[PDB]
mmCIF file of C-alpha atoms in Angstrom:
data_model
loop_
_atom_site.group_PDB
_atom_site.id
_atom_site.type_symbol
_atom_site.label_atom_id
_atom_site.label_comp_id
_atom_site.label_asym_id
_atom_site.label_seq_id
_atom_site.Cartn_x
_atom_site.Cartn_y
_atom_site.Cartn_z
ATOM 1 C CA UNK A 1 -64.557 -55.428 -126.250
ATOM 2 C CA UNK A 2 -66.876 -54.935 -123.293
ATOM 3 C CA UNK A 3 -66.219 -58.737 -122.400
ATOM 4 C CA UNK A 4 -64.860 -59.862 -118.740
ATOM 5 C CA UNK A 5 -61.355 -60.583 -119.525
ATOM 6 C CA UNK A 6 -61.319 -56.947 -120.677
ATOM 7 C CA UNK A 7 -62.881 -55.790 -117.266
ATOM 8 C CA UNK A 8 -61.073 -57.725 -114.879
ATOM 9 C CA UNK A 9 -57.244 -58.321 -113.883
ATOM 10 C CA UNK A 10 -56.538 -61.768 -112.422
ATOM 11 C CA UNK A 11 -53.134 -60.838 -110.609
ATOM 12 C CA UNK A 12 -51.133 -64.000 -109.921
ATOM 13 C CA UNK A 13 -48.687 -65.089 -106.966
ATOM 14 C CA UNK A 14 -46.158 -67.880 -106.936
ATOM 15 C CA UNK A 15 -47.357 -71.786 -106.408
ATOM 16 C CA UNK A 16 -44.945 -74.034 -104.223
ATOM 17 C CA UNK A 17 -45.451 -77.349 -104.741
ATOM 18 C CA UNK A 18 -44.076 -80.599 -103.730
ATOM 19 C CA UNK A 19 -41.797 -82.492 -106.105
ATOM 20 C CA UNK A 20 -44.200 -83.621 -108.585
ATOM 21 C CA UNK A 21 -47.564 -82.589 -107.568
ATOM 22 C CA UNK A 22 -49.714 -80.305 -109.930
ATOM 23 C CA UNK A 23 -51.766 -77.663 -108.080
ATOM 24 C CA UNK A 24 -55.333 -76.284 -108.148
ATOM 25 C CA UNK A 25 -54.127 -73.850 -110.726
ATOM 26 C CA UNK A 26 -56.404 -71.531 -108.918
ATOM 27 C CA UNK A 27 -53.917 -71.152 -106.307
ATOM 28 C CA UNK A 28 -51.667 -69.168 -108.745
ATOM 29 C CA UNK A 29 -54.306 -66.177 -108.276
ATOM 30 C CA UNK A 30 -54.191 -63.780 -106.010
ATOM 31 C CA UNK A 31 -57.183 -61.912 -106.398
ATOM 32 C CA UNK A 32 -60.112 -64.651 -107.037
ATOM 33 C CA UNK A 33 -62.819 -62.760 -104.976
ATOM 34 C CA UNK A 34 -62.228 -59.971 -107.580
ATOM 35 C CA UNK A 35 -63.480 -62.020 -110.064
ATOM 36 C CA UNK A 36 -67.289 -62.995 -111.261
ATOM 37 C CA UNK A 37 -68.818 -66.089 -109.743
ATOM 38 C CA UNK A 38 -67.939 -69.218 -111.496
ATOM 39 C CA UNK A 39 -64.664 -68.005 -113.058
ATOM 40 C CA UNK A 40 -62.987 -71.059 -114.292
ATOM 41 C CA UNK A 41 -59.287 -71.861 -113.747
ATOM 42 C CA UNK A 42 -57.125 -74.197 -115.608
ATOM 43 C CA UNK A 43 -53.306 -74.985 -115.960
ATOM 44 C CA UNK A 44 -53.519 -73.618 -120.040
ATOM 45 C CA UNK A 45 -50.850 -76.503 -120.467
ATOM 46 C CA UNK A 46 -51.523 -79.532 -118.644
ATOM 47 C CA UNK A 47 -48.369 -80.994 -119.859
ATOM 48 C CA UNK A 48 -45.822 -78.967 -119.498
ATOM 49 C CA UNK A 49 -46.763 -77.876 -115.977
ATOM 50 C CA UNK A 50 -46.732 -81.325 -114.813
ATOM 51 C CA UNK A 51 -43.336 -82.331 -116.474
ATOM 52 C CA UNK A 52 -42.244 -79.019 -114.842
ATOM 53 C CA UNK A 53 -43.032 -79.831 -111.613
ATOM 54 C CA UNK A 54 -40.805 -83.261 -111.740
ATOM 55 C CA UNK A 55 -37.842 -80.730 -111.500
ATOM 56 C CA UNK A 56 -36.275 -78.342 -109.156
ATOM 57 C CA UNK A 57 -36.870 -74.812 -110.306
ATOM 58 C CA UNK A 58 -39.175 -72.000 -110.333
ATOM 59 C CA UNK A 59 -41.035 -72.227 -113.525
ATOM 60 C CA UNK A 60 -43.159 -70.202 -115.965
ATOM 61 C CA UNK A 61 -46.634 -71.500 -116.254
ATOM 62 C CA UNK A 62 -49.796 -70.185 -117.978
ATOM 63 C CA UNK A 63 -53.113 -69.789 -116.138
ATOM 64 C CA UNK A 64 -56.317 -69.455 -118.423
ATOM 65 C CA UNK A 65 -59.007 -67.975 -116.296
ATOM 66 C CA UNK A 66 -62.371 -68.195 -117.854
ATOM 67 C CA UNK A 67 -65.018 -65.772 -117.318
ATOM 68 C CA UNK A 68 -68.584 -66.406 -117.808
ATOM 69 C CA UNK A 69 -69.076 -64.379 -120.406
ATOM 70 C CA UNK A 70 -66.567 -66.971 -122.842
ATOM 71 C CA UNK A 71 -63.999 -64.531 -122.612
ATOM 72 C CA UNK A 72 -60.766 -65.817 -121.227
ATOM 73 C CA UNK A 73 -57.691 -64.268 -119.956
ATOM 74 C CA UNK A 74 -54.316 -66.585 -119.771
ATOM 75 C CA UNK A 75 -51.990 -64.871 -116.748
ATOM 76 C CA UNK A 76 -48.664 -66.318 -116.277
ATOM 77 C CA UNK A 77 -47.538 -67.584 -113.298
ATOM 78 C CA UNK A 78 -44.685 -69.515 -111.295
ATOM 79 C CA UNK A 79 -44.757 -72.625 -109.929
ATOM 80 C CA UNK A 80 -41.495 -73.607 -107.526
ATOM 81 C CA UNK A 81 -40.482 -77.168 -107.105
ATOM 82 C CA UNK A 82 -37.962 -77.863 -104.095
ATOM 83 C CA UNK A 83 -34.436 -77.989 -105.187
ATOM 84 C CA UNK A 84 -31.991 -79.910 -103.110
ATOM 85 C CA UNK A 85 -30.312 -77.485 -100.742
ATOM 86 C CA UNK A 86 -27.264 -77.575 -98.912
ATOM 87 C CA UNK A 87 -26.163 -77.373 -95.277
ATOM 88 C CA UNK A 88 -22.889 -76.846 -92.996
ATOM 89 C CA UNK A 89 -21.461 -79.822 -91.802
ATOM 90 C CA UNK A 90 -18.692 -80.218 -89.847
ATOM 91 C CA UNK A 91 -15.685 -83.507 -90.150
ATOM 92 C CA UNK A 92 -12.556 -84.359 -88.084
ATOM 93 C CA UNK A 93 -9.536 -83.798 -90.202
ATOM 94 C CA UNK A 94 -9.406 -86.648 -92.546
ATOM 95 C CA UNK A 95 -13.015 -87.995 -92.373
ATOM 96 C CA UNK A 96 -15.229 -87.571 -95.155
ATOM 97 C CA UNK A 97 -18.782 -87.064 -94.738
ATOM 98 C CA UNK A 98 -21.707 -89.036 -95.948
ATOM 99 C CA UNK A 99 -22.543 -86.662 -99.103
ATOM 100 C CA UNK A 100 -25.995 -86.952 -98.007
ATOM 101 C CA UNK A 101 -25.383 -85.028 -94.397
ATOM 102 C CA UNK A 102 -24.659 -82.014 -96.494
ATOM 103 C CA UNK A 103 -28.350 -81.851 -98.196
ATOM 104 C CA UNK A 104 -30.947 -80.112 -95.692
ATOM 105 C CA UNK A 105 -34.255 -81.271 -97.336
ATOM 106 C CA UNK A 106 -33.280 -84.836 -98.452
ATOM 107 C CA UNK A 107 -37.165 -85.209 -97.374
ATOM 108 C CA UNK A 108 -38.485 -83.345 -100.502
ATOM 109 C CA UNK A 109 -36.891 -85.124 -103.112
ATOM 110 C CA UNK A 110 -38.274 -88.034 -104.920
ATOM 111 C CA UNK A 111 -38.425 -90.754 -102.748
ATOM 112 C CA UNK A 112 -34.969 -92.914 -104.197
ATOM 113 C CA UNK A 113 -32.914 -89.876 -104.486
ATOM 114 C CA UNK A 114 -29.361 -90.797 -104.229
ATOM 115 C CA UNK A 115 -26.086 -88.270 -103.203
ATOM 116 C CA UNK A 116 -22.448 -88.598 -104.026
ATOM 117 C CA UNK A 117 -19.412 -86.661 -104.093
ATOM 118 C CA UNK A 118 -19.022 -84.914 -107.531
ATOM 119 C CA UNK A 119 -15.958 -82.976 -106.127
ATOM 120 C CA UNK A 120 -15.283 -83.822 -102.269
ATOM 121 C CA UNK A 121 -14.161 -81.208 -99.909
ATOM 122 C CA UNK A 122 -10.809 -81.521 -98.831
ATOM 123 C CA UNK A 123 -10.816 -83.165 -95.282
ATOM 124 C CA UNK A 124 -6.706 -83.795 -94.839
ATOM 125 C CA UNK A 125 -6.954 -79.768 -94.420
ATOM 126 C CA UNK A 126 -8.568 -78.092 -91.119
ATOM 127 C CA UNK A 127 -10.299 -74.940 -92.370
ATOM 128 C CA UNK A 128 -13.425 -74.080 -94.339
ATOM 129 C CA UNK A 129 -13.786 -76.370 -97.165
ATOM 130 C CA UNK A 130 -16.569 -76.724 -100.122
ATOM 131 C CA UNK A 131 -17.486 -79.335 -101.686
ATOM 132 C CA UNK A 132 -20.276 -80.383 -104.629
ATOM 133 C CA UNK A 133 -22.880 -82.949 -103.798
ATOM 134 C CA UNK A 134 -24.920 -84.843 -106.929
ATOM 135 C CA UNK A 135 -28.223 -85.493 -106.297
ATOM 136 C CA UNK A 136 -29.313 -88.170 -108.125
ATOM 137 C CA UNK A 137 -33.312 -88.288 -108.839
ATOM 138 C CA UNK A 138 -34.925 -92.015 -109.977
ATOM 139 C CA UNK A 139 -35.550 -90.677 -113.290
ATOM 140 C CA UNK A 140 -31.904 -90.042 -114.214
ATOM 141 C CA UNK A 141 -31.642 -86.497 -113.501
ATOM 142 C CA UNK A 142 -28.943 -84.999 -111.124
ATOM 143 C CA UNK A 143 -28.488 -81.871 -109.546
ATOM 144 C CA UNK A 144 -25.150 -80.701 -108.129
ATOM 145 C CA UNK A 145 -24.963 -78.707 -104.844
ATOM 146 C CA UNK A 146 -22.119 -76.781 -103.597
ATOM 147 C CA UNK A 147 -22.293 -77.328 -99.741
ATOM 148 C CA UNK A 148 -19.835 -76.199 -96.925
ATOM 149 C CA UNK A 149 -17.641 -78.619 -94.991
ATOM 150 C CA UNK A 150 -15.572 -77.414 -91.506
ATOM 151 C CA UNK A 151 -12.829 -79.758 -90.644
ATOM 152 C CA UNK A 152 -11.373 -79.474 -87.151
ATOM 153 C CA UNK A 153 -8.117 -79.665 -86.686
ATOM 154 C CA UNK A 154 -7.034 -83.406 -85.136
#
């Protein structure tokens, strides 16, 4: 059609963001120097990307990039929220961890997140042991982790 979103390709690259913080969607493309001066760009569904971004997950968002011509182009794009991940720990035989120890980056979920036990590792047992931590968000969400737990022997 001769108009800019038929001339140019906006190529994307993955957003991480911090739980619940919407980016510049303009961060989400890769190649802005590419494109004319003044290209516009705007999450195409406010929204959903910020509900999105409330939850662990790499998720598909839309990018409309607009040209100054009027023409548009909508790329898509993903935008990563932290999900709770686990770590090792280690017990004496018989002790049960603190759920929490077992979640490495307790610091980038919501500030109230909670941990339990949904299934506890076996700690009357030396040896290698997994367990599944729930992560419990303020809004009533959960998200269960299958950590590692080494018991020594006592």
């Amino acid at each position: 059609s001769g108009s800019d979103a038929d001339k140019y390709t906006p190529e994307t690259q993955p957003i991480t963001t911090s739980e619940g913080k919407v980016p510049d969607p303009a961060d989400g493309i890769k190649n802005k120097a590419d494109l004319p001066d003044g290209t516009k760009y705007t999450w195409t569904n406010p929204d959903q990307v910020a509900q999105d971004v409330k939850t662990p997950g790499s998720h598909t968002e839309t990018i409309t990039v607009t040209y100054p011509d009027g023409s548009k182009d909508t790329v898509t794009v993903t935008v990563n929220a932290p999900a709770p991940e686990g770590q090792n720990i280690t017990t004496d035989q018989g002790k049960l961890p603190n759920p929490a120890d077992a979640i490495k980056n307790k610091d980038q979920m919501p500030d109230g997140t909670t941990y339990t036990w949904k299934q506890e590792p076996d700690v009357s047992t030396p040896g290698d042991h997994t367990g599944v931590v729930e992560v419990h968000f303020p809004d009533g969400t959960t998200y269960e982790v299958t950590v590692d737990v080494h018991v020594d022997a006592v």
